[PDB]
Amino acid sequence: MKNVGFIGWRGMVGSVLMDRMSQENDFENLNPVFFTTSQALKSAFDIEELKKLDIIVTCQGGDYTNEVYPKLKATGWDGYWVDAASALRMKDDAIIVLDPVNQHVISEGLKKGIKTFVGGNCTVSLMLMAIGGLFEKDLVEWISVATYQAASGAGAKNMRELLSQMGLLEQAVSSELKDPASSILDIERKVTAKMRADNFPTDNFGAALGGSLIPWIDKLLPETGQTKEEWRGYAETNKILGLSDNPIPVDGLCVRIGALRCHSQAFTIKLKKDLPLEEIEQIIASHNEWVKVIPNDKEITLRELTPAKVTGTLSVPVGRLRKLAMGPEYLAAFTVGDQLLWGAAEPVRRILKQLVA
């Protein structure tokens, strides 16, 4: 059995990884060695104890990786580095994992001698898990994205802030909501007043999220005008698919909304060729066992294609599939997917399962 080290296993992404690995009994296939950054179990900064391992799995963050990875590689270490952080995604000796989509790219890299396997961007991963069949058959020319991103992508404190904000908005009009006869405009004025107030907790977001939205996620990239998050749509989709030489244009707007852990996305996919709607629904559905085609019906979309439904599940529903008024080669699609599972912990759990086998 392979000697595997785990760093950042107590954090949010790390905790989901530990729960998922326990659920799938993955610990019975490896020798687990747990690390800690605490000085109050081995030290995550002890390069000697880390060198004794075959595989290192980390969910600690970029600040850790950028400090420990170069030091450990400078000692001649032959092992595997599996990361959940973004720090090493665009490195040439690194492959971005998402096996139900890019098993070929992973298998080729294992044979070529690549020792660093990084998890992909949440939004990009959830997009490829939904509409991966169109990318397989080289049916995608370009894709315009509009995202409805959850608070979990920003962090634990951010989910708490969103929840605290939701409470303060209702509390501001608590008695007024109990009365079925009260003025709706008065209620609104009070909720908006509370949202704009000094004591409203907007520290982690820099703006109100509950009862509102933020059309900006991550640093500005002056060259193209995109945010670092919007750029990852172009950079990462192509690195996962191995198409860095012939890039498929994936661009759009990344917006943070008041959801806890599910990222939802609105797509405008321009296809290379005109194909029937019932054929496209079968090309999407047969890519993997997690994608789910939700029929263009009200009661079924309300019940299936929502954060409320998919939260904490491995299901990746895709619906609202139709031809746009711009032509029969312009497809509309709406997907919902859990950020912490296929967008964080799951691609990591699956590359590890492959390494220890």
Short mmCIF file of C-alpha atoms in Angstrom, two decimals:
data_model
loop_
_atom_site.label_atom_id
_atom_site.label_comp_id
_atom_site.label_asym_id
_atom_site.label_seq_id
_atom_site.Cartn_x
_atom_site.Cartn_y
_atom_site.Cartn_z
CA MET A 1 0.00 0.00 0.00
CA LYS A 2 0.94 3.57 -0.84
CA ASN A 3 1.92 5.96 1.96
CA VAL A 4 -0.34 9.02 1.49
CA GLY A 5 -0.10 12.32 3.34
CA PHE A 6 -3.05 14.65 3.98
CA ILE A 7 -2.74 18.42 4.62
CA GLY A 8 -5.67 20.78 5.20
CA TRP A 9 -8.03 17.90 6.00
CA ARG A 10 -9.81 19.96 8.73
CA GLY A 11 -10.66 22.91 6.45
CA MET A 12 -13.92 23.19 4.47
CA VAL A 13 -12.76 21.43 1.20
CA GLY A 14 -10.63 19.02 3.26
CA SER A 15 -13.60 18.06 5.47
CA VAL A 16 -15.75 17.24 2.41
CA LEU A 17 -12.83 15.12 1.10
CA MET A 18 -12.62 13.23 4.43
CA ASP A 19 -16.38 12.61 4.46
CA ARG A 20 -16.40 11.41 0.82
CA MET A 21 -13.36 9.14 1.34
CA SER A 22 -15.02 7.63 4.45
CA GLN A 23 -18.24 7.14 2.47
CA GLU A 24 -16.41 5.29 -0.32
CA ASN A 25 -14.09 3.42 2.15
CA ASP A 26 -10.99 4.80 0.35
CA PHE A 27 -8.79 4.57 3.48
CA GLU A 28 -8.76 0.75 3.22
CA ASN A 29 -6.66 1.09 0.02
CA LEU A 30 -3.84 3.30 1.35
CA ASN A 31 -1.77 4.16 4.41
CA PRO A 32 -2.98 7.59 5.73
CA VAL A 33 -0.53 9.97 7.42
CA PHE A 34 -2.16 13.14 8.77
CA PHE A 35 -0.41 16.53 8.99
CA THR A 36 -1.04 19.78 10.83
CA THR A 37 0.18 23.39 10.64
CA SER A 38 -0.50 23.60 14.40
CA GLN A 39 2.15 23.58 17.15
CA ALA A 40 -0.38 22.67 19.88
CA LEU A 41 0.27 14.07 14.35
CA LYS A 42 3.11 15.33 12.13
CA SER A 43 4.15 18.85 11.05
CA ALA A 44 3.06 19.94 7.55
CA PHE A 45 6.31 21.96 7.31
CA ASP A 46 8.63 19.01 8.08
CA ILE A 47 10.17 18.35 4.64
CA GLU A 48 11.81 15.17 6.02
CA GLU A 49 8.52 13.56 7.13
CA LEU A 50 6.87 14.58 3.83
CA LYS A 51 9.71 13.08 1.78
CA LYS A 52 8.97 9.57 3.21
CA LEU A 53 5.58 9.58 1.42
CA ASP A 54 4.51 8.35 -2.03
CA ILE A 55 1.63 10.80 -2.50
CA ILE A 56 0.80 14.19 -0.90
CA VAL A 57 -2.85 15.35 -0.96
CA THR A 58 -3.39 18.99 0.04
CA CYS A 59 -6.44 21.23 0.52
CA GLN A 60 -4.53 23.73 2.69
CA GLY A 61 -4.25 26.52 0.12
CA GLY A 62 -1.89 28.29 -2.27
CA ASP A 63 0.14 30.01 0.50
CA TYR A 64 1.10 26.56 1.78
CA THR A 65 1.80 25.01 -1.64
CA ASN A 66 3.98 27.95 -2.77
CA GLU A 67 6.05 27.58 0.42
CA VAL A 68 6.31 23.75 0.70
CA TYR A 69 6.18 22.40 -2.91
CA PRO A 70 9.43 24.08 -4.18
CA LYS A 71 11.33 23.01 -1.02
CA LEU A 72 10.17 19.39 -1.31
CA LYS A 73 10.93 19.15 -5.05
CA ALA A 74 14.44 20.58 -4.46
CA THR A 75 15.30 17.54 -2.29
CA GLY A 76 14.81 15.16 -5.24
CA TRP A 77 11.43 13.70 -4.14
CA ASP A 78 10.03 11.18 -6.69
CA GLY A 79 6.40 11.19 -5.41
CA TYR A 80 2.97 12.59 -6.40
CA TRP A 81 1.51 15.99 -5.43
CA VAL A 82 -2.32 16.12 -5.55
CA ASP A 83 -3.61 19.67 -4.93
CA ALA A 84 -7.00 21.35 -4.52
CA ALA A 85 -5.55 24.91 -4.61
CA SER A 86 -5.15 27.03 -7.76
CA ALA A 87 -1.44 27.79 -7.29
CA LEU A 88 -0.04 25.15 -9.68
CA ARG A 89 -2.84 24.66 -12.26
CA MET A 90 -1.10 26.45 -15.14
CA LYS A 91 2.38 24.91 -14.59
CA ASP A 92 3.73 22.77 -17.47
CA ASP A 93 4.67 19.82 -15.22
CA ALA A 94 1.09 19.88 -13.85
CA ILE A 95 -2.16 18.34 -15.12
CA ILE A 96 -5.64 19.58 -14.20
CA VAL A 97 -7.83 16.62 -13.21
CA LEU A 98 -11.48 15.87 -13.98
CA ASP A 99 -11.46 12.18 -14.96
CA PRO A 100 -15.02 11.69 -16.31
CA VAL A 101 -14.04 14.31 -18.91
CA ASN A 102 -10.24 13.99 -19.34
CA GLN A 103 -9.21 10.41 -18.47
CA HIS A 104 -7.04 10.30 -21.64
CA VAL A 105 -5.09 13.46 -20.70
CA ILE A 106 -4.51 12.03 -17.18
CA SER A 107 -3.51 8.52 -18.40
CA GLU A 108 -1.05 10.01 -20.92
CA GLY A 109 0.52 12.27 -18.30
CA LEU A 110 0.97 9.40 -15.83
CA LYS A 111 2.91 7.54 -18.54
CA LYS A 112 4.85 10.67 -19.57
CA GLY A 113 6.03 11.12 -15.97
CA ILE A 114 3.95 14.09 -14.67
CA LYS A 115 4.01 14.15 -10.86
CA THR A 116 1.61 17.03 -10.09
CA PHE A 117 -2.17 16.63 -10.36
CA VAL A 118 -4.26 19.70 -9.56
CA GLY A 119 -8.04 20.02 -9.19
CA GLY A 120 -9.76 22.41 -11.59
CA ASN A 121 -11.76 25.62 -11.20
CA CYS A 122 -15.19 24.96 -9.75
CA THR A 123 -17.24 26.76 -12.41
CA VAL A 124 -15.25 25.16 -15.30
CA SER A 125 -15.46 21.65 -13.75
CA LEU A 126 -19.23 21.91 -13.20
CA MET A 127 -19.63 23.20 -16.78
CA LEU A 128 -17.63 20.29 -18.31
CA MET A 129 -19.49 17.72 -16.17
CA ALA A 130 -22.77 19.07 -17.57
CA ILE A 131 -22.03 19.64 -21.26
CA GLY A 132 -18.97 17.39 -21.69
CA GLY A 133 -20.50 15.35 -24.52
CA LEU A 134 -20.55 18.39 -26.81
CA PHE A 135 -16.82 18.89 -26.17
CA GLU A 136 -16.12 15.19 -26.85
CA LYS A 137 -17.68 15.31 -30.34
CA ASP A 138 -15.96 18.68 -31.06
CA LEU A 139 -19.39 20.27 -31.43
CA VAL A 140 -18.46 23.43 -29.49
CA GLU A 141 -17.18 26.47 -31.39
CA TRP A 142 -17.67 28.91 -28.52
CA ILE A 143 -19.60 29.29 -25.27
CA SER A 144 -20.87 32.46 -23.61
CA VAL A 145 -21.29 32.12 -19.84
CA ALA A 146 -23.30 33.95 -17.14
CA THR A 147 -22.78 32.44 -13.66
CA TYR A 148 -24.86 32.34 -10.45
CA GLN A 149 -22.12 31.57 -7.92
CA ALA A 150 -22.46 30.39 -4.34
CA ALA A 151 -20.83 31.78 -1.19
CA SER A 152 -18.78 28.59 -0.56
CA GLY A 153 -16.43 29.39 -3.44
CA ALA A 154 -15.25 32.46 -1.49
CA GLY A 155 -14.90 30.62 1.84
CA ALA A 156 -16.42 29.47 5.14
CA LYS A 157 -16.67 32.97 6.71
CA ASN A 158 -18.41 34.11 3.53
CA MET A 159 -21.21 31.50 3.90
CA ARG A 160 -21.67 32.68 7.51
CA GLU A 161 -21.80 36.31 6.37
CA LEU A 162 -24.46 35.50 3.75
CA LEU A 163 -26.56 33.70 6.38
CA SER A 164 -26.16 36.52 8.92
CA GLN A 165 -27.19 39.03 6.23
CA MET A 166 -30.36 37.05 5.36
CA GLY A 167 -31.41 37.07 9.01
CA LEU A 168 -30.88 40.80 9.52
CA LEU A 169 -32.98 41.60 6.44
CA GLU A 170 -35.98 39.63 7.70
CA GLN A 171 -35.55 40.74 11.36
CA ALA A 172 -35.79 44.35 10.15
CA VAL A 173 -39.41 43.66 9.10
CA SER A 174 -40.32 40.75 11.42
CA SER A 175 -43.63 42.04 12.84
CA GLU A 176 -44.64 43.53 9.47
CA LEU A 177 -44.36 40.17 7.69
CA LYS A 178 -46.64 38.49 10.31
CA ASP A 179 -49.44 40.94 9.36
CA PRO A 180 -51.01 39.89 5.97
CA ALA A 181 -52.47 43.40 5.59
CA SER A 182 -49.25 45.49 5.91
CA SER A 183 -47.65 47.69 3.20
CA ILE A 184 -45.15 45.94 0.90
CA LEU A 185 -43.38 49.20 -0.07
CA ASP A 186 -42.82 50.07 3.62
CA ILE A 187 -41.39 46.57 4.19
CA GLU A 188 -39.04 47.03 1.23
CA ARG A 189 -37.83 50.48 2.38
CA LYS A 190 -36.90 49.01 5.77
CA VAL A 191 -35.06 45.95 4.32
CA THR A 192 -33.15 48.21 1.89
CA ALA A 193 -32.37 50.61 4.78
CA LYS A 194 -30.91 47.73 6.82
CA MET A 195 -28.92 46.51 3.79
CA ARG A 196 -27.37 49.99 3.43
CA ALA A 197 -26.75 50.50 7.19
CA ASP A 198 -23.39 50.77 9.01
CA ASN A 199 -23.92 47.67 11.15
CA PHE A 200 -24.75 45.37 8.18
CA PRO A 201 -21.84 42.79 7.96
CA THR A 202 -20.30 43.20 4.50
CA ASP A 203 -16.67 42.57 5.56
CA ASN A 204 -15.97 39.29 3.74
CA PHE A 205 -17.68 40.33 0.48
CA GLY A 206 -17.07 44.10 0.39
CA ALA A 207 -20.76 44.50 -0.52
CA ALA A 208 -24.14 43.06 0.45
CA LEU A 209 -24.87 39.55 -0.87
CA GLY A 210 -28.10 38.65 0.90
CA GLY A 211 -30.95 40.29 -1.02
CA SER A 212 -28.47 41.41 -3.71
CA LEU A 213 -25.56 40.22 -5.93
CA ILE A 214 -21.90 40.96 -6.72
CA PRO A 215 -20.85 40.99 -10.44
CA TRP A 216 -17.16 40.66 -9.62
CA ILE A 217 -15.18 37.64 -8.34
CA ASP A 218 -11.33 37.80 -7.92
CA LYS A 219 -8.59 40.25 -9.18
CA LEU A 220 -8.77 42.34 -12.37
CA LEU A 221 -6.58 41.32 -15.32
CA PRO A 222 -5.81 44.68 -17.12
CA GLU A 223 -4.86 42.97 -20.43
CA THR A 224 -8.28 41.56 -21.41
CA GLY A 225 -10.52 43.31 -18.86
CA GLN A 226 -11.61 39.95 -17.38
CA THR A 227 -11.52 39.07 -13.68
CA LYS A 228 -9.16 36.18 -12.76
CA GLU A 229 -12.27 33.98 -12.35
CA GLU A 230 -13.64 34.81 -15.83
CA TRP A 231 -10.18 34.16 -17.33
CA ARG A 232 -10.13 30.63 -15.84
CA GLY A 233 -13.04 29.83 -18.16
CA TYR A 234 -10.71 30.19 -21.17
CA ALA A 235 -7.41 29.01 -19.61
CA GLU A 236 -8.62 25.95 -17.67
CA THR A 237 -11.31 24.49 -20.01
CA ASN A 238 -8.62 24.21 -22.65
CA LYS A 239 -5.94 22.82 -20.33
CA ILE A 240 -8.36 20.13 -19.03
CA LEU A 241 -9.25 19.18 -22.62
CA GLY A 242 -5.60 19.38 -23.75
CA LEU A 243 -6.55 21.98 -26.37
CA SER A 244 -3.99 24.69 -25.43
CA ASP A 245 -2.74 24.70 -29.05
CA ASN A 246 -6.25 25.18 -30.55
CA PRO A 247 -8.30 27.12 -27.87
CA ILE A 248 -12.13 26.97 -27.81
CA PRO A 249 -13.36 30.50 -26.78
CA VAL A 250 -15.12 30.25 -23.39
CA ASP A 251 -15.89 33.68 -21.92
CA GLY A 252 -18.54 35.53 -19.93
CA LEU A 253 -19.54 37.13 -16.63
CA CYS A 254 -18.96 35.59 -13.19
CA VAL A 255 -21.51 36.76 -10.58
CA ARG A 256 -21.83 35.90 -6.89
CA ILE A 257 -25.43 35.35 -5.66
CA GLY A 258 -27.06 34.37 -2.35
CA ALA A 259 -26.69 30.56 -2.58
CA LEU A 260 -24.73 28.41 -0.09
CA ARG A 261 -22.83 25.73 -2.01
CA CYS A 262 -24.16 25.30 -5.57
CA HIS A 263 -22.93 27.14 -8.64
CA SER A 264 -25.48 27.56 -11.39
CA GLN A 265 -24.67 28.63 -14.95
CA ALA A 266 -26.50 30.07 -17.97
CA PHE A 267 -24.97 29.12 -21.32
CA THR A 268 -25.21 30.26 -24.91
CA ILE A 269 -23.38 27.47 -26.78
CA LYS A 270 -22.57 27.98 -30.46
CA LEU A 271 -22.37 24.61 -32.13
CA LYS A 272 -20.18 23.82 -35.17
CA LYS A 273 -23.09 22.08 -36.95
CA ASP A 274 -26.91 22.07 -36.91
CA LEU A 275 -28.18 18.94 -35.12
CA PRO A 276 -31.70 17.98 -33.86
CA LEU A 277 -32.71 18.81 -30.28
CA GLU A 278 -33.51 15.18 -29.32
CA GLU A 279 -30.08 14.06 -30.59
CA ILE A 280 -28.23 16.76 -28.59
CA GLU A 281 -30.08 15.66 -25.42
CA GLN A 282 -28.71 12.13 -25.88
CA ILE A 283 -25.11 13.32 -26.58
CA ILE A 284 -25.17 15.27 -23.27
CA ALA A 285 -26.87 12.51 -21.21
CA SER A 286 -24.52 9.67 -22.21
CA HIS A 287 -21.20 11.42 -21.37
CA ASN A 288 -21.20 10.38 -17.70
CA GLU A 289 -23.56 8.89 -15.06
CA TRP A 290 -23.71 12.12 -13.03
CA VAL A 291 -25.10 14.48 -15.70
CA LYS A 292 -28.92 14.59 -15.81
CA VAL A 293 -31.03 15.99 -18.66
CA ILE A 294 -34.00 17.85 -17.14
CA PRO A 295 -36.88 18.15 -19.68
CA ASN A 296 -38.06 21.67 -20.63
CA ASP A 297 -41.16 21.49 -18.37
CA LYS A 298 -42.07 23.85 -15.47
CA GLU A 299 -42.91 21.49 -12.56
CA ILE A 300 -39.84 19.38 -13.39
CA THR A 301 -37.41 22.35 -13.76
CA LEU A 302 -38.65 23.78 -10.43
CA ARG A 303 -38.15 20.42 -8.75
CA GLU A 304 -34.84 19.42 -10.38
CA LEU A 305 -32.73 22.31 -11.76
CA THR A 306 -32.18 24.24 -8.48
CA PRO A 307 -29.49 24.66 -5.73
CA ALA A 308 -32.13 23.44 -3.22
CA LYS A 309 -32.27 20.08 -5.02
CA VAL A 310 -28.61 19.43 -5.91
CA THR A 311 -26.89 20.62 -2.66
CA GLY A 312 -24.67 17.91 -1.16
CA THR A 313 -25.28 15.52 -4.07
CA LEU A 314 -23.07 14.35 -6.95
CA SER A 315 -25.84 14.99 -9.50
CA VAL A 316 -25.11 17.56 -12.26
CA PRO A 317 -28.49 18.55 -13.81
CA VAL A 318 -28.64 20.36 -17.15
CA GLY A 319 -31.81 21.77 -18.63
CA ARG A 320 -33.58 24.61 -20.44
CA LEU A 321 -32.19 23.07 -23.66
CA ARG A 322 -33.52 24.77 -26.78
CA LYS A 323 -32.48 26.53 -29.98
CA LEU A 324 -31.97 30.30 -29.71
CA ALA A 325 -33.53 32.96 -32.02
CA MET A 326 -30.04 33.55 -33.47
CA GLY A 327 -30.11 30.20 -35.28
CA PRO A 328 -30.51 26.35 -34.86
CA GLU A 329 -26.75 26.11 -34.15
CA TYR A 330 -27.11 28.31 -31.03
CA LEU A 331 -28.04 26.22 -27.97
CA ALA A 332 -29.32 27.46 -24.61
CA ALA A 333 -28.45 25.48 -21.51
CA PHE A 334 -28.76 25.96 -17.76
CA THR A 335 -26.90 23.83 -15.23
CA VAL A 336 -26.65 23.52 -11.43
CA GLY A 337 -23.85 21.72 -9.55
CA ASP A 338 -22.46 21.43 -6.00
CA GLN A 339 -19.27 23.52 -5.66
CA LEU A 340 -17.65 21.44 -2.92
CA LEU A 341 -18.14 18.08 -4.64
CA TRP A 342 -17.42 18.07 -8.43
CA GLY A 343 -16.01 21.57 -8.08
CA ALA A 344 -13.51 20.80 -5.29
CA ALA A 345 -13.26 17.50 -3.39
CA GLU A 346 -14.44 14.90 -5.91
CA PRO A 347 -11.84 15.31 -8.73
CA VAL A 348 -9.18 15.11 -5.99
CA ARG A 349 -10.64 11.91 -4.41
CA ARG A 350 -10.76 10.23 -7.83
CA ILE A 351 -7.20 10.91 -9.01
CA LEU A 352 -5.97 9.62 -5.60
CA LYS A 353 -8.04 6.40 -6.00
CA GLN A 354 -6.26 5.90 -9.34
CA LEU A 355 -2.82 6.49 -7.83
CA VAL A 356 -3.21 4.06 -4.91
CA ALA A 357 -4.73 1.25 -7.03
#
